[PDB]
């Protein structure tokens, strides 16, 4: 049932694209069939987004942002400072980029320490931390699993495929691998999964949700455990739903 999956996917979106653009994003998040789970903006845009969401009567739409982004550099102090600033701006959620090049160079420890430091900041402010591992740069299945594992161990609240800023973003395969790690680690209660990119259409979204359904059961993928972001996806979902 494409309509049923499209509605579910819509309510799982972190919708992402000046003040005019932020304000328009917020408006777009309030759709005729429901609200997206969140909007995603740069940290500096959080205050104006919060005001806009409030003014339009959608205060429960979450505000997510990005730090250590999009590079995934291995400077913990910079990543942490950015994350504290995101929090101070008013983020509900911070999507931090894992130091994936460092892991490809054999340094697992800095990924652990970077995620942990950011998680600690987030948790003290009741902010969720997503960790972007950049599956499209890691490429290798074992590296995708290791990055996922290190992120979970360090306290990620979500593991996320991609920044959306490299040539290769989510695929069904990388999504499967990452959700298999959640399952294999036994952390499906505490750790969500987010697809970024590779999900252009309603039909695509249905497939991604089906993976989660098959691994965890059909009730698992609520907004605390599953999110989507991709250019064009909202329009495709709305079209499936007749808008
Ligand atoms: C995973 C989040 C990616 C992303 C890209 C761009 C923006 N933005 O335009 O604010 C937010 C989040």
UniProtKB/Swiss-Prot annotation:
Pathway: Carbohydrate degradation; 2-deoxy-D-ribose 1-phosphate degradation; D-glyceraldehyde 3-phosphate and acetaldehyde from 2-deoxy-alpha-D-ribose 1-phosphate: step 2/2. The keyword Lyase applies. SMART domains: DeoC (SM01133). Keywords: Cytoplasm, Lyase, Schiff base. GO terms for cellular component: cytoplasm. GO terms for biological process: 2-deoxyribose 1-phosphate catabolic process; carbohydrate catabolic process; deoxyribonucleotide catabolic process. It is an enzyme of class 4 (lyase). It catalyses: 2-deoxy-D-ribose 5-phosphate = D-glyceraldehyde 3-phosphate + acetaldehyde. Disulfide bonds: none annotated. The active site is at residues 95, 160, 194. GO terms for molecular function: deoxyribose-phosphate aldolase activity. The keyword Lyase applies. Its EC number is 4.1.2.4. It comes from the Bacteria. InterPro entries: Aldolase_TIM (IPR013785), DeoC (IPR011343), DeoC/FbaB/LacD_aldolase (IPR002915), DeoC_typeII (IPR023649). It is found in: Cytoplasm. Catalyzes a reversible aldol reaction between acetaldehyde and D-glyceraldehyde 3-phosphate to generate 2-deoxy-D-ribose 5-phosphate. NCBIfam families: deoC. Belongs to the DeoC/FbaB aldolase family. DeoC type 2 subfamily. HAMAP family: DeoC_type2. This is Deoxyribose-phosphate aldolase. It comes from Escherichia coli (strain ATCC 8739 / DSM 1576 / NBRC 3972 / NCIMB 8545 / WDCM 00012 / Crooks).
